[PDB]
């Protein structure tokens with residue numbers, strides 16, 4: 001028997017089998033519904049497209065995300081997403097496969113409980129288990145000690161771990177992520193006359209961000225050089241034309257991660273919440289944590305983010321300490337890699353939540369020692 | 372009109388191969404400069420370690 | 427036996443390539459955890475034997491590419507990982523040549 005590893009996240013579902021090097025099914029977690037009339041009789045069109053199919057018909061659908069900030073807010077849409085993942089992208093019968101799911105730290109309890117209730121009643125899996133994303137990042141990184149910064153698409157968090165013991169009082173969670181960066185980039189593109197208002201134009205803006213944005217090493221000097229020269233201007237070709245020219249908002253967008261006041265948040269940047277989690281930990285492990293600062297998730301994929309975060313954390317920490325930032329090239333999939341590793345471990349086979357345990361104890365079995 | 376946009380396509384091809392050969396020569400000179408930079412930065416990282424050790 | 431002289435020549439050279447795999451040398455990078463080759467001579471000669479490009483084989487050892495859905499992303503490696511990969515490659519090619527030699531033997535014997 002094999003276990004499935006479904007890493008949902010907020011905006012990119014990626015699933016596969018336990019024991020592979022990568023997910024075999026990566027698609028956006030969107031559910032589209034047609035918003036126009038529909039004239040051709042006999043077209044036999046459907047009522048809701050999910051996944052990558054909804055990306056080809058953006059000009060006709062209104063796109064919803066069923067997961068806002070880690071939290072699932074539309075259970076019907078999420079059930080559709082899971083059905084698509086099981087039957088159309090993977091082509092497996094979920095009644096004969098254990099399933100490992102992930103979630104972010106410090107979410108509501110009903111999210112997790114309703115998740116397992118769905119997975120047992122509707123999809124009828126034999127076993128299941130929910131894992132923290134940062135722990136799986138640390139498995140895939142090849143470490144057992146380090147502070148992991150997992151910037152996804154809805155939520156960012158730090159989780160310090162030492163020798164396999166997680167320090168729950170030092171976990172930080174921040175609701176600034178790729179979706180907020182996309183909204184900020186849409187808002188500041190209007191300074192040059194481009195306007196993207198539709199949910200289908202949000203995707204165009206996301207592709208722009210992924211392809212052109214980067215983190216500046218020195219924000220003020222980059223602003224000065226963009227004001228003076230014109231060597232930063234880069235062009236992008238929309239699905240039609242009118243190539244858009246992007247100047248300093250190439251790096252003003254991801255700078256929101258280090259200055260969350262740009263989008264009117266009160267909190268501090270990711271470098272500063274990382275340092276604060278460190279100083280929140282004990283004193284005997286701070287050196288190892290400084291030396292094992294692990295990045296993962298898609299929002300950590302900008303060019304220059306590792307160097308920027310090292311500069312900031314080095315300016316913060318004492319001078320006698322060597323700061324190191326681990327940023328693999330397969331960061332975007334680290335949670336899935338770690339999930340596959342963990343589910344393939346033979347020690348883990350006693351940690352699943354079997355269906356009989358659930359039937360006898362209710363969905364409360366999930367927060368129990370069966371974590 | 373076919374020969375017209377044809378001639379423009381050909382002159383675009385000329386200047387485009389110009390841009391391409393500039394791309395390749397530039398990337399050669401810049402990869403040489405790069406390798407030089409990493410040689411320098413590694414030798415100076417080792418020298419920084421030596422200095423802190425003597426300190 | 428049924429097989430030509432070129433084929434014995436290829437067998438011998440393949441075994442010599444397996445022998446040349448062992449002397450490869452890798453170092454960590456400047457301020458990262460990535461493996462990069464310092465010695466390239468045995469790499470060049472092993473590629474010239476194997477029928478591949480030396481730079482291409484070095485790139486394939488230091489930076490594997492894996493399939494994530496419909497895209498390819500490059501995986502990172504350190505010295506221990508690249509050494510384990512080299513050893514597994516050598517064991518694989520040897521065992522492969524062995525099994526195929528047995529197939530050739532059985533084809534010669536076949537009535």
Ligand SMILES: Nc1ncnc2c1ncn2[C@@H]1O[C@H](COP(=O)(O)OP(=O)(O)O)[C@@H](O)[C@H]1O
Nearest residue numbers: 009010011012152153178210297298299301302
């Ligand atoms: N190369 C890139 N540069 C910048 N941002 C990226 C890049 N690739 C993906 N992203 C951002 O990462 C987000 C997806 O992150 P992901 O790892 O899928 O998190 P989740 O799985 O929780 O949705 C997207 O919103 C996208 O904007």
